Design an enzyme around this catalytic site. Sequence first.
Site, mmCIF file in Angstrom:
data_model
loop_
_atom_site.group_PDB
_atom_site.id
_atom_site.type_symbol
_atom_site.label_atom_id
_atom_site.label_comp_id
_atom_site.label_asym_id
_atom_site.label_seq_id
_atom_site.Cartn_x
_atom_site.Cartn_y
_atom_site.Cartn_z
ATOM 1 N N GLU A 1 -4.576 3.759 -10.864
ATOM 2 C CA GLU A 1 -5.195 2.567 -10.711
ATOM 3 C C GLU A 1 -6.156 2.479 -11.538
ATOM 4 O O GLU A 1 -6.768 1.053 -12.381
ATOM 5 C CB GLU A 1 -5.786 2.443 -9.320
ATOM 6 N N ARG B 1 -0.143 4.520 2.998
ATOM 7 C CA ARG B 1 -0.116 4.398 4.248
ATOM 8 C C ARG B 1 0.387 5.655 5.225
ATOM 9 O O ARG B 1 0.182 5.685 6.310
ATOM 10 C CB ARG B 1 0.962 3.253 4.676
ATOM 11 N N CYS C 1 0.686 -1.197 -0.153
ATOM 12 C CA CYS C 1 0.029 0.119 -0.021
ATOM 13 C C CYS C 1 0.953 1.317 0.068
ATOM 14 O O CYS C 1 1.602 1.724 1.061
ATOM 15 C CB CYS C 1 -0.793 0.051 1.119
ATOM 16 N N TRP D 1 -9.252 5.979 -0.833
ATOM 17 C CA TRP D 1 -9.560 6.621 -2.255
ATOM 18 C C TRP D 1 -8.527 6.192 -3.231
ATOM 19 O O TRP D 1 -7.513 5.662 -2.792
ATOM 20 C CB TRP D 1 -9.479 8.350 -2.025
#
Lengths: 411, 420, 411, 420
Positions: free
Chosen positions: A287, A113, A110, A282
Site C-alpha cells: 500500500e 480479515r 479487505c 495496520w
Amino acid sequence: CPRFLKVKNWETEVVLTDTLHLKSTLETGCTEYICMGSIMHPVATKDQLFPLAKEFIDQYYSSIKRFGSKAHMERLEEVNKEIDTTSTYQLKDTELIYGAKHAWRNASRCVGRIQWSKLQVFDARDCTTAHGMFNYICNHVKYATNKGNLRSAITIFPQRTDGKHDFRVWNSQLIRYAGYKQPDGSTLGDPANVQFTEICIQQGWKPPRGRFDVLPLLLQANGNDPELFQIPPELVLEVPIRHPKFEWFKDLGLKWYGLPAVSNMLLEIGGLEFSACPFSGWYMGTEIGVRDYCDNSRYNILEEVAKKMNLDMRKTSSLWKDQALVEINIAVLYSFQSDKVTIVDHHSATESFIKHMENEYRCRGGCPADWVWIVPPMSGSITPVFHQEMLNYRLTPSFEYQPDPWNTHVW
Amino acid sequence: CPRFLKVKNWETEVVLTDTLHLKSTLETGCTEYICMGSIMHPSQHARRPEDVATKDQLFPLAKEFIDQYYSSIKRFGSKAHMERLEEVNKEIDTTSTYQLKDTELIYGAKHAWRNASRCVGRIQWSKLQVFDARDCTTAHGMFNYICNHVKYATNKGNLRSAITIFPQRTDGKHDFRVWNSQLIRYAGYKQPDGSTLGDPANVQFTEICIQQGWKPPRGRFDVLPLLLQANGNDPELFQIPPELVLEVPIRHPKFEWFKDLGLKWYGLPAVSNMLLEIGGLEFSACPFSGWYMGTEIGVRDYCDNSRYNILEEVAKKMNLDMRKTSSLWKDQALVEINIAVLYSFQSDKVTIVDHHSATESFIKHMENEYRCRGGCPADWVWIVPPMSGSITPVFHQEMLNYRLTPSFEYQPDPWNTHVW
Amino acid sequence: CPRFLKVKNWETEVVLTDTLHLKSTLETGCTEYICMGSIMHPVATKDQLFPLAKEFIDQYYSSIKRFGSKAHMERLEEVNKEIDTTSTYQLKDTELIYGAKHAWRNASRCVGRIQWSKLQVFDARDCTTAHGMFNYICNHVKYATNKGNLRSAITIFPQRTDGKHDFRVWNSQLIRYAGYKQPDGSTLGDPANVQFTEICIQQGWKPPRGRFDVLPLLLQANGNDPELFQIPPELVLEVPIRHPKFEWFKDLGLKWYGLPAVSNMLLEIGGLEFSACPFSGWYMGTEIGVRDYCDNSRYNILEEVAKKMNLDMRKTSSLWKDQALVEINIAVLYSFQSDKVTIVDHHSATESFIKHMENEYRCRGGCPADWVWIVPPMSGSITPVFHQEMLNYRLTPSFEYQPDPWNTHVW
Amino acid sequence: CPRFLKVKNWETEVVLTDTLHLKSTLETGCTEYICMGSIMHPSQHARRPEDVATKDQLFPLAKEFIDQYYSSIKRFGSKAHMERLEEVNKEIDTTSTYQLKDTELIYGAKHAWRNASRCVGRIQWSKLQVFDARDCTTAHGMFNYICNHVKYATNKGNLRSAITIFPQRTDGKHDFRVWNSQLIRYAGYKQPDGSTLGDPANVQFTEICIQQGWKPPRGRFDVLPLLLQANGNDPELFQIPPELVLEVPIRHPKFEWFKDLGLKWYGLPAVSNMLLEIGGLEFSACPFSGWYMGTEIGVRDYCDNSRYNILEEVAKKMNLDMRKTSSLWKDQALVEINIAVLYSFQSDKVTIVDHHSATESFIKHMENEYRCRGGCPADWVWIVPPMSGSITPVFHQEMLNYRLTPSFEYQPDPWNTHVW
Ligand code: HEM
Ligand code: HEM
Ligand code: HEM
Ligand code: HEM
Ligand SMILES: C[C@H](O)[C@H](O)[C@H]1CNc2nc(N)[nH]c(=O)c2N1
Ligand SMILES: C[C@H](O)[C@H](O)[C@H]1CNc2nc(N)[nH]c(=O)c2N1
Ligand SMILES: C[C@H](O)[C@H](O)[C@H]1CNc2nc(N)[nH]c(=O)c2N1
Ligand SMILES: C[C@H](O)[C@H](O)[C@H]1CNc2nc(N)[nH]c(=O)c2N1
Ligand SMILES: NC(=[NH2+])NCCC[C@H](N)C(=O)O
Ligand SMILES: NC(=[NH2+])NCCC[C@H](N)C(=O)O
Ligand SMILES: NC(=[NH2+])NCCC[C@H](N)C(=O)O
Ligand SMILES: NC(=[NH2+])NCCC[C@H](N)C(=O)O
Ligand SMILES: [Zn+2]
Ligand SMILES: [Zn+2]
C-alpha cells in the site's frame, strides 16, 4: 437460486462451495449482460427501517445461539416500538460491537480479515461537539498506535438522524500528508490530498508547505460547520525509509506514517447509518511501497530511485521500473521492521487471507471477496490469491462509500 | 434499462462513455447480486456443447451477423444485403445450416479477435492472416494446414498473426478438433518420485499421446506431437517437423550463470483448443497465433507453483536470503527471470513485447475503440499483467466486460467427449 | 440474492415472506427479459451423481434432525462408495418414502398438496417383468380406490440404469378411455387418447369401439417391448353422471372413472430417476366437469347440454356456455357424492390450498406454486387463489415430464 | 442466447413463432430460477420513481424510439431520420430533455397500447383518438381537457377509445397527475360497524377528497370528484358535470327482482393513474379509455369479496341452498350477475363486450400480430377472464410475456410522494 456456487483454486485444484451468497440482499452493480467488477464505485423512512432492524436483530440473536428466545422477542418488540415512536432506534452496546466486527468480516475488498474478531470498539455515541470528536480520535490514535505494536480499533460517532445533524470526519484518513499545487502545475507532497489541503488552508490552517506535513483534523459534529484541530505531534508515529543495502536510500528523505486510519466511510448496521466511524488496523507494505510512492498520481518516485540505482532507463523492456519497485518495497518493510512498527508483506498477508477464506467457507459457507482489490498491486501471480476464484457480493452490516462532505455541507 | 456507461482512468482522469455494451446479447455470468468477475469459466446459460444449433437458434444469429457485416461495409439495407439474407435463410431453412462467404469468414475471425475481452494485444486486431481450411477432410490434411500456419506465423522470428479455420460443426458427430491446447507445447510427466518432469499443465495430454503410441523422450522440454481429429474420427499423431519449431534458450544479460539453468521456450504461442463462433456457425478447430508478452513465459509459465516453478532455483543462484517472506526474495527473482526472457527473445530477434509496452498500447487501442466503436469490452482480471500490476496503466483503468459476437469461446477437452 | 421475496394477497392484504426459493438449484425457463409462465413444457455420470446424492442425503438427515451424526456421515460414505464402484446407488426405504412425499410437496402445479405427507408408498423396486408390473398396478388400483373412499398412493418401479433398461407405463394415466378416429374426421371416445389407442390396437388389443372403453395397460419392464394387460373390470370404479334437478341429464349417457392415476411422469430423487412411478389421489370436480367434458378437443359436450337446457344459443353474450358449464359441474360433484366416491369441489380445494400455503410459509419459508395451473379452469376470481400472488421455482425431489415412450423405443 | 420461440395452442394445435421478443429491452421480474408471472408489480430494476432520466439514460432511449418510428413509416436511414435524430440529440445535450413531434406522440401512444401485455382489447390498438394536452398549465385546464375526453369517448353510449396526454415530467418537481385511479369511480366509506359503504377500493382516495373539502353524499354509488395536480402544485378538486357521466342501472332479463338490488355501474372505464413512457420521456398524467368487458364489472367489481361483494345477496334472492360449497351456489349466482351486466348495457345501447367475444377477437389479434410483427407480448394471468377460464380460447393459448416500449407503466400513488 442457484443454491450452490463453486469456486476453484487453479494451483491446488481445491473446489469450494459457497452458500453464504444466499444471504445477500443488496445489489453489486453487475447484470447478467455486463460485469462492473473493475469500476471503483459502481434518510430511512419508518417502513424501510422496520425490516432492516428485524433482519439485523434476527441475525444477532442467531449468532449468539438464542434465536427464538424471549430475550430475542422482547428486543424485537422494544426496537419496533422505538422506531414506531421516534422513527429510529438505538443499538445496545453488544449489538454495536457485533455490527462493527461483522462489517469488517463482510468487507469484500479487505485482505486483512483474518483479524476480524480482534477489534477494539470505542463507543462514541454520546459525543456532541467537535472538540469531543477530537478527544475520542486522540484516544483512538494513542490506543491503536501502542508504540508501534499496532492494534485494530474503530471509533463510532452518533448515527444519522434527519441528515442535517450528521457527524463527519472530513479527512479521508486520520493521518495523511498535505498536498499543494505549484505554480508550474506540479504538486508538492501528496497529490491525493490537494483538495482537502485547500479546504484546510481556507479554514485557517497555517501550512508548513513541505513534502510530508501531517494534515490537521477537520471535524463536523451534529451537522455544524467543521472545526480544525492539530493532532498532538507526539501521537503521530512515523518511520523514515531506508534500505538494507543502499546507503543512499535514506538520502531520498522519504518517510511514512505508521497508522492507516480510514475515516471517510459509512458503517451501516440494521438500517442505521454511522457516517463517522474511523477505523484502523495496520499496513500491508505494498500500500505504501507500490501505491503511495509509485503511483504516477501519488509521490511518483520510480524515476528518482532508478536514477540512484544507476539503471538503464532508455528502454521499457529493461524492466527498470520493476527493479526499482522491488527495492522500494524491500526498504518500506525493512524500515517498519527495524523500527518495530507492525507491518505485513504481501506474501504473508495473502497467504493468511487464503487460510481465512478456507476457515470462512467451513464455518460460514463462504467469504465475499473482490479479486481486483485483494490481489496485491505488484507480483500478483506469485501470491496465492491471484490463483483463487472468488465471488463478490454484499452482506450487511457493511462499510460503504459516502460523498465527500464538502460536496454537501452548507456553511 | 438501457443506459450509456462511464469508465474512468484514476491516474489520467480521462472519462469515456460506453455505448457499445448496449449491443451485447450473450450473458457474462454475473447477476445483480453476485459478481463472477474472477471465475475463469462462469456458467452463462450457454446451450450444451454436444448439441448443435436448431433453426430457431440459427436464424436470429445469422441475421445479426449478416446485418453487422453489411453495416460494417456501409451497405446496410442494400439489395446485396437483402439478397445475402435471403440466401442464408433458404440455406438454414432447407439444410438447417449455412456457409459463410470468404469475405464474411475473414471479417468474422478479425472481429472475434476484436471482441476478445481477455486479450491485451487487440490494437493488432485487423492485421490477421486468415487461412481458410474449410475444404480440409483428413487428419493428414489438417497436419499440412498446421505446418503452413506454423511456417507463415513464425516467419524466421518476425512473427505474424494468423488463424487457420477448419470445417464448422455439422451434426456434432463430424467435428474437427485439434486435441493439443496450443500447437507447440512441452510434454509433462508424472515421475516415480511423485514429482513432475516438464510442464505439469500437459501431463494428461502427454499420457494420451503416449497411450496412442508416441515415444516420449522424457526430458524437460519435449515438443509435443500434434493429435488431430478430422471429421469426428479418432485423432492421429504427427510430429511437427523440428525445423519449423523456433525455440529460444534463456540467458540473462548480467548473470552468466543463468544459461546453466538450461531454460528455453518456444517462440510461437498458438492457442488451438478454442471455438470460433461466427453468426451461429461453430468452428471447433481454429488455431490462432500472435506473439508473446514476456510475462506469459517469465511469470506464469516459469514461476507458477503448478508450472515450471523455477523461483527457488533462481533465488538460490542469486544467493538471496530466503528465510523470510518480507525480504521479497521471490519478487527479486521474478524480476530477473522476466528480464532474461525479454533479453533472450530480443537477442535472437524473435518478436516479443514487454508488459509495459503491451499495456500502454492497449490503453491507446481502448481510446481508439471508444472513439470509433463506442467501447471496448475488457476483462481487467486478465488484462492487468501478473507482475507489477499498478506500474502499468491498465491497473488504473476502469473497464467494462461484456460479450460481443463473433467470439472465441471455450469448449470441453475432446477426450471428455470422444467415444473411440 | 435476493434473500427475501414477498407475495401479497390482494383480497386480504396479507404479505408473506419467501426464503424457500433459496434452496432452488434447477432452472424454470424464464429469463430476466421473458416470462414463460404459460408455456406448458418450457444418464447421469458419476461426477454428476455425487453432488446430487450428497444434497439429498444432507436434506434427508436434516429433516430427521440428525444432520452431522454418526449415521449421516456413514450414509454419505456408503453412498459415495456405491457411486464410485457401480456408478449408481440405492435408496433406503426410508429415503424413498421421504423422497416421494417431498416430490409431491414440491409439485408447484398441484392444488392438493395439503395432503402431501399422507401418501402410501408402494416400493416396487424388486420388479423385473411386465406381469410383475401388472400385479403391482392391480395392488395400487385396489388399495387407492378402496371402494370409493380413495387413498393417495404411489408405486415406484426400478430406477433407470443405462437408459436401455427403463421401466415405463405407456399409459398417461392407469385408467383412461379409448379414442377412435372416424372416417369423417370426428372422434369417438376421448380424442386425447387416439394415438395411444391406435398403438394398443396395433399391439393386438381388440377394441370395443364405444365412447367410454377403459384402455388396456401397456407396460415396459427392463427396456423390453411393452405388453398388454386388461385391468380386471371389478377393480375399475366408475360413476354414471346425473344431475340433481335435470332428470334428462342421465340420458346423455355420461360417466367417468373414480381414480385419477397419472402414470407417465418421472420421479427424481437425489439424482436418481424413476421413470415409472404411477401416483394417484382423487379428483377435483372441474378436472372432469370443465376440462374432460367441456374442452373442445375433449368430449366437448357443451352444446348438447345447452340444447337440452333449452338456452338461446344464438349469441355469445347470453352466456349460454357459462350456464351449461355450471350445470355440468354440479352434476359431476352430485354424482360422485351420491355414489360415495371421494371428490373435492374447486372452492373447497383452493381454500384448503391457501391454508396449506400459509402453513408452508410458516414452517418451511415458502411454497412454490404455478398460478396458471392452480387457479381452477372455471370461476377463477371467486376462488381465493386467483387473488394470491405465488412464486414458482423448482425444488428437488420432484416430478418431471419425460418424452412419450413410443418416440424413443426401439422395437 | 437469442432464439426464436414457439407458442402452441393446445386446442387448435396452431404453433406460432415469436421473433419479436428479441427486441425487448426492459426486464420482466423473473429470473432463470424464479418465475414471477403472478406478482402484480414485480421489481424490474427500474430507476427510482422520483428520479428523472439522466442524459446517459435518455440518449439511447430516444435513439431507439426515433429509429423504430422512422422504421415504421418505412424511412429508416433517410435524411429526415438522420436530421430528426440530430435534432433530438442537440436537445438532450443542451436541456437534458427533448420534445416529441405530434406524429411521434400519436405513434407512441398507439404502440404503448399495442405493447400492453395485460390488455385483451388490443385488436383495436390503431383506432385511438389522441388528445394532445401538452400545452396544459393549470388544474382547471386539466379539468377542461378531461371533460373533453369524457364527452368525446362516451359519445352517448357509442364508446370511442381515447387518450389525453398532459405535459411530460421535467425536474420531477413539476409533475402533472390525476390523483384519481380512474376518471369515473365510486366513493367508499368505512362505517362504524367495520363494513364499507360503496366501493372499498376507493376508501383512501375518498378520505383524501373529504379532507380536501369534498362534501360526501355518503351513498353506495357516489361519483368521485377529480383531484387534479398541475405543474407539481397541490391538487385541486373538480366535480365532473353529472350529465357527462353515463351510468347503467343493472337489471336481469328473467329475474324481475334483480333491479331491486339497486345496482348500477358507469359506462366509461378511464384508467388515469398510469405513466406513459415514450422514448424515455415520461407522461405521468395520461388518462385513457376504451369500453368494458362484462366480467370487469360482473365478476370483479361486483363479486370480489373486497369490492361490492354481492354474491350471497344475489344467491339469497335466487333462493339457492347456500349450506355447502359443492352446490356451486356461488358459480350459479356469478353467471346470472354477468348475464345481467351484459343485458343492461346492451338494452341501454352502451358499448360492452362479453368475455367469449373479447378473447376470440384477441386470439385473432395475436395471429395477426405474429404474422405482421413476429409476436404479441401477452400476460396470460391477466388475459384469461376471471370466470369460465377454459371455455374461452385464451386459456388454451400459450403466451410469451415481455416488455416492449413505448409502454404504459405503474407509478406510485401521488399521495405517497407529494409534498404540500
Ligand atoms: C489489521 C490489519 C489490516 C490489514 C493488513 C488490512 C488490509 C487491507 C488492505 C491492504 C486494503 C486495501 C487498501 C487500499 O488499497 O486502499 C484493505 C481495505 C479495507 N479494509 Fe482492511 N486491513 C486491515 C484491517 C481492517 C480493519 C480494522 C477494518 C475495519 C474495521 C478494515 C476494513 C477495510 C475496508 C472497509 C476496506 C476497503 C476500503 C476501501 O474501499 O477503500 N480493514 N484492507
Ligand atoms: C499479436 C500479439 C498478441 C498479444 C501480445 C496478445 C496478448 C494476449 C495475452 C497476454 C493474453 C492472455 C494469455 C494468458 O494469460 O494465457 C491473450 C489472450 C487472448 N488473446 Fe491475445 N494477443 C495477441 C494476439 C492474438 C490473436 C492473433 C488472437 C486471435 C485472433 C488473440 C486472441 C486472444 C484470446 C481469445 C485470448 C483469451 C485466451 C483465453 O481465454 O485463454 N490474441 N492475448
Ligand atoms: C389427494 C388429492 C389430490 C388432489 C385433489 C390433487 C389436485 C391436483 C389437480 C387438480 C391438478 C391439476 C391436474 C390437471 O390439470 O391435469 C394436480 C396436478 C398435479 N398433482 Fe395433484 N392432487 C392430488 C394428489 C396428488 C398426488 C398423490 C400426487 C403425487 C404424489 C400429486 C402430484 C401432482 C402433480 C405432479 C401434478 C402436476 C401434473 C402435470 O403436470 O400434469 N397430486 N393436482
Ligand atoms: C377497446 C376497448 C378495450 C377493452 C375491451 C380492453 C380490455 C382490457 C381489459 C379487460 C383489461 C383488464 C383490466 C383489469 O383487470 O383491471 C385491460 C387492461 C389494460 N388495457 Fe385495455 N381494453 C381496451 C382499451 C384500451 C385502451 C384504449 C388502452 C390504452 C390506450 C388500454 C390499455 C390497457 C392497459 C395498460 C391495461 C393494463 C391496466 C392495468 O395494469 O391495470 N386498453 N384492457
Ligand atoms: C480501475 C481499478 O478498479 C482500480 O485501479 C483499483 C484496482 N485495484 C485496487 N486494489 C486495491 N487494493 N486498491 C485500489 O485502490 C485498487 N484500485
Ligand atoms: C482465479 C483467476 O480468475 C485466474 O487465476 C486468472 C487471473 N488472471 C489471469 N489473467 C491472465 N491473463 N491469464 C490467466 O490465466 C489468469 N488467471
Ligand atoms: C396454455 C396454458 O398454459 C394451458 O392451457 C394450461 C393452463 N392451466 C392449466 N391448469 C391446469 N391445472 N391444467 C392444465 O392442463 C392447464 N392448461
Ligand atoms: C395475484 C394475481 O396476479 C392477481 O390477483 C391478478 C390475477 N389476474 C388478474 N387479471 C386481470 N385481468 N386483472 C386483475 O386485476 C388480476 N389480478
Ligand atoms: N491496512 C489498512 N487498514 N489500510 C487502509 C487504507 C490505507 C491506504 N491504502 C494507504 O496507503 O494509506
Ligand atoms: N500472446 C498470446 N497469443 N498468447 C496465447 C496464450 C499463451 C500462454 N499464455 C502461454 O504462456 O503459452
Ligand atoms: N387430482 C389428480 N390426482 N389429478 C391428476 C390429473 C387428472 C386429469 N386432470 C384428468 O382429468 O383425468
Ligand atoms: N376495459 C378497460 N379499458 N378497462 C380498464 C380497467 C377497468 C377496471 N377493470 C374496472 O373494472 O373498472
Ligand atoms: Zn461482475
Ligand atoms: Zn416467469
